Design a protein around this ligand. Structure first.
Ligand SMILES: Oc1ccc(Br)cc1
Ligand SMILES: Oc1ccc(Br)cc1
Ligand SMILES: Oc1ccc(Br)cc1
Ligand SMILES: Oc1ccc(Br)cc1
Ligand SMILES: Oc1ccc(Br)cc1
Ligand SMILES: Oc1ccc(Br)cc1
Ligand SMILES: Oc1ccc(Br)cc1
Ligand SMILES: Oc1ccc(Br)cc1
Ligand SMILES: Oc1ccc(Br)cc1
Ligand SMILES: Oc1ccc(Br)cc1
Ligand SMILES: [Cl-]
Ligand SMILES: [Fe+3]
Ligand SMILES: [Fe+3]
Ligand SMILES: [Fe+3]
Ligand SMILES: [Fe+3]
Lengths: 491, 102, 305, 83, 491, 305, 102, 83
C-alpha cells in the first residue's frame, strides 16, 4: 500500500529551524530575503494552495513534454513557415525572441526564493518553479531552432537578450527589475502574483486562441502547456501576500503589486498589443487586445486581487484609459521604426482592418487613422523616404519604450519629467515617474538608448551605427513591412 | 469604466482548460458536481473558460466517469491552463471559490 | 555597411561548431546575459543592490576563467531527459515502497531499529533541505548556464531525497507510533550532539556567498562527506538490523549523488585550465574540510552508539 | 553648438529627439522638427508654427533663439500652430 | 400684477455678444478666463441650478442679517467668554482668525468670475457671490470685534492675514492658489465646486453642531446662516464642470478637482481636526472629526461628485487612511509649538478623553498616546522645558504645515522630496508633491517659513526672533495651554 | 523681548483713531493683504501668472498713493446697510411695476413708443451688463478694500439695472408682441449704428487692465456719459410719449448712479493728495472722452430719429 | 474602506435645515409631499439632515400649510444650510434628486 | 560649518530641522537629534542610535562624519535603533 500525500505532506515542509552558529539575519539577509523583519516562526503559517510532490511532478511533467514534442514532430510538414500570413510569422519571431531567454532568467527569480524565502512551503514550490522555468526556456529555444535554417530573424530567439536592441533592453530592464534584481519576497509578489497570475495569460493563452484560429497548433499547444506550469508556480504569491497583510505589511505589499502591474502593462502593450490588433490576420483575431485585457486582467486578475484583500491600484482610471490608447501608438512606432526590430511588423491598416479597429475602438480613424492616412498616401505614391525614420524617438527612462500620446483630431501627449541628482529624466506616464521615485537607487544611473546616443556611446551617430550597436549582423535581420507594402493595393 | 466596473464586479470561478481531451469531460463534470448552479462556457478554441457563481467543484470520481478512463486528480494539471477563483485541491476534488461577494 | 548573410543551421554562437549541435547544446548554452557587461550584470542602475551583489560574489570571485560557458555537463542532461530518467527511478522507488509495505517490512526490523531511525535518519530532512537551499544558491550565482543547469537538477534531487525521507518517516511511524517519528526531528537537529557538527557546517556553508566558494564547499566538501559518512554507513547499519528497504532506497539516492559528483569533477577539470585555480580550490577545500570532518565524526558516533 | 531637444509636434503620435542649434530662432527650430513629422505622419496645413515649453501656455517669440530662451539641453518642447 | 421670475429670467442672462472692436480672446484672455479654447456660443448652455434675482436677493439677505445681528445683541450678557471652556474660546479665536479675511479674499474669486467667465449665468451668480462673501467677511470681523477689549488674541480676526504666522501662511498659500491666483473657470471648479460644496460644511455646519452642544448660539446661528449663502453660490461649479466634460475637457476638469480637494483637506485637518476631537469639550462633541468627514465629505460630497460624472480621485485610499491619522499628529504639533499660534490649544488628553479617542480611533493610545504619555509625565513632574520646543518643525513646501507621520508602536513617517531647478523641496504626501508637479510655475519660487529661516530672513534666528517675524506684538498674544495644564490633575 | 500690553478697544490698526471706530471702519478697512508684499502680492511663487498680473496692473499703475487704505466711502455703506437701503428702493420699484401694470399703463403710451423702446431701451441690458463686468474688474484690482467695497456695491447696482431692463422688456412685450421686444436686442447691440459707439467704447474699456485707467475710464468717463446722454434723454422722451413709468424707474436708477459718482469723486480727491496724479487722471480722461462722446452722439441720433 | 464604500454607496437626497422655525415644518412637508417614501431625519441640534432615496420634493403649498404663515419658496434660503442631491427649484417647489443610482 | 538636516526620530510624530556640524560623527548627529525628541515625545530606551538617509535600508557607520557621508544640506535622515 502507499500512503496519500495529505498524510505526509507536512513533513516535506517541516524544514525551518532556529539558527545557532550564524544569526537568522545572516542566514536570511533582508537584501536577498525581503522578510521585512517578520520572524521565522510567522513564516511557518505560509500554505501554498497548489501543491505537488517530487514523484508526481516528474511523472506529470514527463507527460506534458511528450505531448508538446509529439505534436511539433507530427506537424513539421504542415508548412506554417511558408503558408502562414507573414504577420503570423512575425508574431512567432517576436514571441520567441522576447520570451525564451527571459523564461530562463525566471529560473533565477525562483532560485532566489528557494534559497532566501523564510517560508518552507515557498522554498519547495520555488524548487518546482525553478524546474518549470528551465522547461519553458528550453522549449522556447528548441521550438524556433528548426527555423534558423529558414530565416536569420529566428536567431533572435537566442540572441535578443544578448543584444542592445531597443525591445531587448525594455524586456531586460523589466525582468531584471521584477525577477532577478530584488529580494525573494519582492519576487513572490511582483513575479509570481502580479506578473504570472495577471499578465502572462494574455501572451500564453490569449495569443494561443489567435494561434488556434490561425491554424498553428504546434504553437498554440506549446504555449498553453507552458501556462499549465505557470498556473501552479504562480500560486506562490497569494500566500506571501496574505502573510504580509497579517503581519502589518499591507502598505509595502500594495506598493509592490501596484509597481509590478504597471511595469508589466507597458511591456505587454508593446509586444502583445500590436500582435493582437494588427499582426494577427483579421480573420484570426479571436478578440481584440482590449477585449482580452477585460477578460484576463480586469475580470479575472483584478477580481482575484480584491478577493485577497488588496485594493485597486491608485492609477486604475489611468490604466483603463491606457488600454483604449497606448498600444495603437506603440504599434505605430514599432512599425515606423521597423528597421530596429528583429521581426517584420505588419501595418494592419487595410480598409477592412480599419473598419474592425473603428468597431473595437470607436474614434480610431480620427486619431491614429490620421497618421496612417499620411503613411498610406506616401506608400501609394512611392515616397518611401517618408516611411523610414531619420531621427530617434524620445524614450521613457522607466519602460525603455518611446514617449507617445494620442494623435489626430484630439491630439494630446504628455511627458512626465524629473530632475534627480543633477540629471533630467523623462517618463511616459505619471505612474512610471512614480515607480522611479519609489526606488531611485534601482534606476538612477541607468541610461536608456537615447541617453547613450547623446553620450557618444553609439558610434557612428547614424541609423546604421544605431543598428550595429543594437546587434544586427546582416541586412536580412532588420525589420521590414511584413507584406512588403502589398497592403496598400487594398487602399 | 461603466464597462470596467461591470467586468470587475463578477463572482465567476472555474477552470480554464486548454484544447484537448479534457474540455468536454470537465464541462460535463462541472454540470454534474454543481447541481443547481448554472455553468457558463466560453469557447476560445485554444482554451475554454468554464465558470459558476461563487464556487465550482470538480470531483475526481465524476471526472473519471466523464473522461472514460482511470484518472488521478493531480493529472488535471496537464490541461488546467488557468483558473478563476482561489483554489483548494486534494486527491478527491478541486474547489474554485471566492472569499468575497462582489 | 550591412552585408547579406545566409541563414545559419543553428544559433549564431554555435554556427562554428564542428559537430551538429545536440539538443543539449541548443537549449542549454550561453543563456546568462548577466555576464555580458562587467559593469552592470543586470539592466538596471550599475550600482543597484543586486548589481553590487553580483559584481562582488560572482564577477570578483578568485575562481577565474575566460570561458565558463564552455563547461559541459558530462551527462548532458536537459529538462526533458532528466524527467524521463527520474520518472523511471521514482517509479522504481514507489514500487519498492508499495511492495515492502505489503510485506510488512517495517514490522520485521531488528528490535530497537525504529529508535535508531528516529535519531539518525528522520532528521536528515533538515540536512537534505540545506543541500536543496544551497544548490539553489549556486544555480543563481554560477557564471555559465551550463553550470547553473547542473545546479537546478541538483536542487530538484535534494528535494527528492527530502521527500523520500518525509514519506518513510511518516510510514515508519505507523508501525512504531511511540518513537517520536515525525515529531522530534527539529529538536534533534537543533540540540542533539550528533547533528550539531552537520548543522554548524550547513549554517556556515549557507552563508558563503562567493559563487566559487559556495560551489567548492557544497560540491567538493559537504556532498562527498554525505556519501562517505552518512549514506554508506546507514546502509551498513540497516543491513545489521534487517532493514532491507533502506539499502535499496539509498542506492537510488546514490545514483543522484554520483551524478552530482560527475558534473562537479567536470567543472573542476574545466576550472583548472587556469593554473591560478589550483591554489584557490585547494585553499577552500582546506578551509572547509575540518568542519566537514567534525560533522562526520559526530554523526557516526551518534549512529554507532 | 548642437543642442538636443525632445519635441512633440501637433497631431503627431510621439515625442522625438531633434538636434537643433544654439543660435536657431524658434522659427528655425519649428522647421527642423516639422521635417521629421509633416508629410510623414502629420498632414501639412496653413498657419504659423510656434514653439513652447512642453505643456506651456506661453509661446516663445518667433525670432528668439534657443540660447536666449533659457531652455536646457534635452528639455521637452511642443511645436504647435497659432489659433 | 407682477410677472413670475420664470417668464423673464432668460433675459437677465442674455448678455453674451460677439465682440468686434476687440477679439473674443482679448475680451476673455485665457490666463484670466480659463475657457480652455471653448467658444462663447458653447457657454450659453450654462444653467445655474440655484437661481435668484436682485429684488429677491436684497429682501432675503436683509432678513438673514436682521436675525444674525438680533441673536448676537440678545445674547451679549450670556457670559460665553467668561463661562465657556477655554478650549471653546480657542475654537472661536482660531475660526475668526483663519476665516474672516479669507472670506473677504473670496470676493475676489467671485469677481474674477463676474468679469472673466464666458458663461452669462455664471457672471450674474458670481455677482451675488461677490456680495455674499462681502457679507461673510463683514460678519466675521463684526462678531469677534466685541472681544478685542477682552483679549488681544481676538485682534487676529483682523490681523492673521496681515502676518507671517505659520497658520496664516498656510491659509494664504491655499486661498491664493484656489481663490485669487487662477483663472475664472479654475475658481468655479476649485473654489465653488471642490471647496464650497465639499469642505466648508465641516467648519460652518459640523462645528455649528458642536457650538450648539456648547451653548454658544450666537456663533452656531451665525455660521449656519453664512452656510445658507454658500449653498447658493457654491452651485456655480457643477454647471461649469458639466460643460467642460461635454466639451471634451473632462481630464483637465478632473485634475483641477483632485488638486483642490487634497489642498483643502490638509488645511481642514490642521484647523477643524484639532477643534473637533480635542478643543471642543468632550460633552459637546456631537460626532468625531472622522464621523463628520464620513457624513459631509464621503456620504454627501463624493456621492455628488459621482452623480456629476467625475471619478473618485486617484488618491482615494490614501485620503481615507489620512482621515484616521493626520489630524492627531497635526493637533500634537500645534499643541507642542502652541507658542506660535494666536489661540490657546487644549491638549485634550485627560483619561476620559483618551477613552473617547480610543473608541473613535482604535489603536490611538498605542500611537499618539505614547507621545502624550511622555508629555503628561513631564507636566506632572514640572519639567516644563521639555513641553516647549527648541527647534523648528520641518514644513511641507505645498501645505505649509509640518511633516508628520504615525508615532508610537507602529512608527511610520514619510517625506516625499523633489529636486526642481537646483532646489530641494519636501512634501508631506505623494499628493502634495503631485500638486506641485501639476503647475510648478505657481509654486517653484515660493519659500516656506523654514526655507526663510535657513536663508537668513528671520532675525534673530531664535524662537523669539521667529515669533516677532510671525507678527506677535505682546507676550499675551502667544498661544499657551488652554487650561494652563490643569488637565494633568486628572491624570 | 516681548512686553505686556493691554487689550485694545478695537483692531490694532484702528487703535490710534481719535473717534470711536464705526461699523463701517471695523468691517471695511485694510483687508487687502495682497498689497503688503510688493514683490509677491499673493502667497505663491513671486513670478506666478497672477502675481505678475497684479505687479503689472495694480502695483505699477501710474496712479500712485502712499495710503490708498485711508480712502473712505462718503456714504460709508456696509453690506447690511446697502441691503436695507436697496430693499426699500426695490420694494418701491416693485410697487410701481405692480400698480402701473394694474392700470394698464403700457396700453396708453403714445403710438409707436413700443418701437422706440425695442430699439433704444431693451438693448441697454448689454450696456448695463458691461458696467457690471467692468465694476467687478475694478473691485478685484483696486489697491484698498474701502475702494473695492464701493466697486462691489456698484457691480450689484449694475445687475439691478440689468434686471429692471429685463423685467420691463418682457412686460412690454406682453402688450406689444410684434416689436421684437426680448427677441432682437443682441442683433441691435451688434449691428445697429446707434449702439455701435457704445459697444466699441465698452469692448475697449473692458480691455483696459490697469486698475487706475479702469477706474477712470469706467467711473469718470463712461458712467457720467450714461447719466447725461442715456438716462436723462430717455426720461425726456418718455415724457413726450406718455410713458409715466420710465421716468420714475430712471429716477431710482439715478440715485444709484449719483452714489457711484459720490464715491468716484471722493477717490479722485484722495488721489490728488499726490500732485503727480492730476496729469495721470487728466490724460486718461482725454484718452477716453472722444470714444465716450461718439458713443453718446450715435445713441442720441438713434433715439431722436 | 468597507465603511467608506458603504458611506459612498447611498442615494440619499434632501435638505439640511439649520436650527430655527423651519425644521419641523420641513420634516412634515417632506413626509406629506413624498407619500410612500420613507423620510430619515438626523438631528445635530444646530441643523437637521432630512433625506429620502433618489428624490425628495418640497412644495411651497405644503410648506406654507405646515409652517402656518404666508411663505414664498425663495424664503427657504434663509434656513437651507446645505442639501444632498442636485437641486431643481421654482416658485412652486424644490426637488432634490440624483441622476445615478449607486 | 553648520549643516542643516531634516531628521525623523524613531517613534516620534514628525520630522524636525536639526542643525548639526559638518565634522560631526553619526553618533554625534544622533545625540543632537535625540535632544529634541527623547524625553519630550519619545520614551528613552536602551540600545544604539544609528543614522540613515530617510527610508533607507543602509545605515551610515557610527564613526563616519557628515562630510564623509555625502549628504547634502536639508536632506532628510532617520535616527533609529539597531534591531
Ligand atoms: O522603435 C520604436 C518602437 C516603439 C515606438 Br512608439 C517608436 C519606435
Ligand atoms: O541618425 C539616426 C537616425 C535614426 C535613428 Br533610429 C538613429 C540615428
Ligand atoms: O524604445 C526604443 C525604440 C527605438 C529606439 Br532607437 C530606442 C528605444
Ligand atoms: O492536489 C491537487 C490536485 C489537482 C490539482 Br490541478 C492541483 C493540486
Ligand atoms: O518520494 C516518494 C516516492 C514514491 C512514494 Br509511494 C512515496 C514517496
Ligand atoms: O506649529 C506647528 C503646527 C503644526 C505642527 Br504638526 C507642528 C508645529
Ligand atoms: O531657535 C528656534 C527654536 C524654535 C523655533 Br519654532 C524657532 C527657532
Ligand atoms: O507649519 C509650521 C508650523 C510651525 C513653524 Br515654526 C513653521 C511652519
Ligand atoms: O427688478 C424688479 C423689481 C421688481 C419687480 Br415686480 C420686477 C423686477
Ligand atoms: O427658485 C428657488 C426657490 C427656492 C430656493 Br431654496 C432656491 C431657488
Ligand atoms: Cl503620482
Ligand atoms: Fe515560464
Ligand atoms: Fe512562470
Ligand atoms: Fe463665504
Ligand atoms: Fe463661499
Amino acid at each position: 500500500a502507499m500512503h496519500p500525500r495529505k498524510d505526509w505532506y507536512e513533513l516535506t515542509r517541516a524544514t525551518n529551524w532556529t539558527p545557532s552558529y550564524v544569526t537568522e539575519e545572516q542566514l536570511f539577509p533582508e537584501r536577498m530575503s525581503g522578510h521585512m523583519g517578520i520572524p521565522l516562526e510567522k513564516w511557518e503559517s505560509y500554505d501554498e494552495p497548489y501543491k505537488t510532490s517530487y514523484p508526481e511532478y516528474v511523472s506529470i511533467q514527463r507527460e506534458k513534454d511528450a505531448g508538446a514534442y509529439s505534436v511539433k514532430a507530427a506537424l513539421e510538414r504542415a508548412k506554417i513557415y511558408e503558408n502562414s500570413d507573414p504577420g503570423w510569422i512575425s508574431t512567432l519571431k517576436s514571441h520567441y525572441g522576447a520570451i525564451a531567454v527571459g523564461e530562463y532568467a525566471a529560473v533565477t527569480g525562483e532560485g532566489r526564493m528557494a534559497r532566501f524565502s523564510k517560508a518552507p512551503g515557498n522554498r519547495n514550490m520555488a524548487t518546482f518553479g525553478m524546474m518549470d522555468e528551465l522547461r519553458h526556456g528550453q522549449l522556447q529555444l528548441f521550438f524556433p531552432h528548426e527555423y534558423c535554417k529558414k530565416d536569420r530573424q529566428f536567431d533572435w530567439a537566442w540572441r535578443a537578450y544578448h543584444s542592445n536592441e531597443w525591445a531587448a533592453i525594455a524586456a531586460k530592464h523589466f525582468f531584471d527589475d521584477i525577477i532577478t534584481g530584488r529580494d525573494a519576497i519582492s519576487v513572490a509578489i511582483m513575479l509570481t502574483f502580479s506578473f504570472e497570475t495577471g499578465f502572462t495569460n494574455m501572451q500564453f493563452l490569449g495569443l494561443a486562441a489567435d494561434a488556434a484560429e490561425a491554424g498553428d497548433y504546434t504553437f498554440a499547444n506549446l504555449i498553453s502547456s507552458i501556462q499549465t506550469d505557470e498556473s501552479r508556480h504562480a500560486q506562490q504569491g497569494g500566500p506571501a501576500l496574505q502573510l504580509l497583510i497579517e503581519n502589518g505589511k499591507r502598505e509595502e505589499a500594495q506598493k509592490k503589486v501596484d509597481m509590478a502591474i504597471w511595469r508589466a502593462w507597458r511591456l505587454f502593450a508593446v509586444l502583445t498589443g500590436p500582435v493582437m490588433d494588427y499582426y494577427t490576420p483579421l480573420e484570426d483575431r479571436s478578440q481584440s487586445f482590449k477585449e482580452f485585457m477585460y477578460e484576463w486582467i480586469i475580470g479575472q486578475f483584478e477580481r482575484s486581487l480584491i478577493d485577497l484583500g488588496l485594493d485597486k491600484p491608485w492609477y486604475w482610471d489611468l490604466f483603463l484609459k491606457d488600454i483604449d490608447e497606448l498600444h495603437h501608438s506603440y504599434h505605430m512606432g514599432v512599425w515606423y521604426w521597423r528597421t530596429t526590430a528583429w521581426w517584420n511588423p505588419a501595418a494592419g491598416v487595410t480598409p477592412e482592418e480599419r473598419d474592425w479597429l473603428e468597431e473595437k475602438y470607436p474614434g480610431w480613424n480620427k486619431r491614429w487613422g490620421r497618421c496612417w492616412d499620411v503613411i498610406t498616401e506616401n506608400v501609394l505614391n512611392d515616397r518611401m523616404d517618408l516611411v523610414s525614420p531619420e531621427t530617434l524617438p524620445s524614450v521613457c527612462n522607466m519602460s525603455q519604450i518611446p514617449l507617445v500620446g494620442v494623435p489626430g483630431d484630439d491630439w494630446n501627449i504628455e511627458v512626465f519629467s524629473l530632475e534627480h541628482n543633477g540629471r533630467l529624466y523623462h517618463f511616459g506616464s505619471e505612474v512610471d515617474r512614480w515607480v522611479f521615485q519609489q526606488d531611485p537607487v534601482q534606476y538612477q544611473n541607468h541610461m536608456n538608448i537615447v541617453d547613450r546616443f547623446l553620450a557618444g556611446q553609439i558610434q557612428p551617430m547614424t541609423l546604421e551605427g544605431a543598428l550595429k550597436y543594437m546587434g544586427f549582423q546582416s541586412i536580412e535581420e532588420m525589420g521590414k513591412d511584413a507584406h512588403d507594402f502589398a497592403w496598400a493595393d487594398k487602399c | 469604466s461603466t464597462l470596467a466596473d461591470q467586468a470587475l464586479h463578477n463572482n465567476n470561478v472555474g477552470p480554464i482548460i486548454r484544447a484537448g481531451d479534457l474540455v468536454e469531460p470537465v464541462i460535463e463534470t462541472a454540470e454534474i458536481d454543481n447541481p443547481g448552479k448554472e455553468i457558463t462556457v466560453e469557447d476560445r478554441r485554444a482554451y475554454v473558460r468554464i465558470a459558476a457563481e461563487g464556487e465550482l467543484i470538480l470531483t475526481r470520481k465524476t471526472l473519471e466517469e466523464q473522461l472514460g478512463r482511470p484518472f488521478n486528480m493531480q493529472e488535471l494539471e496537464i490541461n488546467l491552463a488557468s483558473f478563476a477563483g482561489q483554489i483548494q485541491a486534494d486527491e478527491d476534488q478541486i474547489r474554485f471559490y471566492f472569499d468575497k461577494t462582489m | 555597411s550591412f552585408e547579406s548573410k545566409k541563414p545559419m543551421r543553428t544559433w549564431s554562437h554555435l554556427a562554428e561548431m564542428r559537430k551538429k549541435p545536440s539538443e543539449y547544446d541548443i537549449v542549454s548554452r550561453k543563456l546568462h546575459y548577466s555576464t555580458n557587461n562587467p559593469d552592470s550584470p543586470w539592466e538596471l542602475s550599475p550600482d543597484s543592490p543586486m548589481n553590487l551583489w553580483y559584481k562582488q560574489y560572482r564577477n570578483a570571485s578568485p575562481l577565474k576563467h575566460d570561458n565558463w560557458d564552455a563547461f559541459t555537463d558530462p551527462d548532458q542532461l536537459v529538462y526533458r531527459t532528466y524527467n524521463l530518467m527520474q520518472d523511471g527511478q521514482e517509479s522504481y522507488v514507489q514500487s519498492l515502497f508499495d511492495q515492502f509495505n505489503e510485506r510488512e517490512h517495517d514490522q520485521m526490523v531488528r528490535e530497537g531499529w525504529e529508535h535508531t531511525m528516529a535519531r539518525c535518519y528522520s532528521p536528515l530532512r533538515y540536512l537534505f533541505h540545506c543541500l536543496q537551499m544551497s544548490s539553489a544558491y549556486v544555480q543563481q550565482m554560477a557564471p555559465a548556464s551550463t553550470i547553473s543547469n547542473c545546479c537546478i537538477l541538483q536542487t530538484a534531487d535534494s528535494l527528492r531525497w527530502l521527500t523520500h525521507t518525509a514519506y518513510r518517516t511518516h510510514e515508519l511511524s505507523l508501525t512504531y507510533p511511540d518513537a517520536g517519528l515525525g515529531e522530534h526531528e527539529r529538536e534533534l537537529w537543533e540540540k542533539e550532539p550528533g547533528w550539531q557538527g552537520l548543522r554548524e557546517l550547513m549554517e556556515k556553508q549557507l552563508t558563503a556567498f562567493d559563487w566559487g566558494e559556495a560551489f567548492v564547499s557544497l560540491n567538493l566538501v559537504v556532498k562527498p562527506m554525505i556519501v562517505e559518512s552518512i549514506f554508506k554507513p546507514l546502509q551498513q547499519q540497516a543491513w545489521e538490523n534487517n532493514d532491507t528497504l533502506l539499502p535499496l532506497l539509498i542506492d537510488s539516492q546514490l545514483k543522484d549523488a554520483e551524478r552530482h559528483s560527475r558534473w562537479s569533477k567536470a567543472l573542476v577539470k574545466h576550472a583548472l585550465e587556469n593554473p591560478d585555480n589550483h591554489a584557490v580550490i585547494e585553499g577552500w577545500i582546506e578551509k572547509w574540510r575540518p568542519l566537514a570532518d567534525r560533522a562526520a565524526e559526530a554523526y557516526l558516533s551518534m549512529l554507532s552508539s | 553648438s548642437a543642442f538636443p531637444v525632445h519635441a512633440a509636434f501637433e497631431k503627431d503620435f510621439l515625442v522625438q529627439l531633434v538636434v537643433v542649434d544654439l543660435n536657431d530662432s524658434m522659427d528655425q527650430v519649428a522647421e527642423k522638427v516639422a521635417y521629421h513629422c509633416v508629410n510623414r505622419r502629420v498632414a501639412p496645413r496653413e498657419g504659423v508654427m510656434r514653439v513652447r515649453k512642453h505643456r506651456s501656455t506661453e509661446l516663445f517669440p518667433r525670432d528668439m533663439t534657443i540660447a536666449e530662451s533659457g531652455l536646457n539641453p534635452t528639455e521637452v518642447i511642443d511645436v504647435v500652430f497659432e489659433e
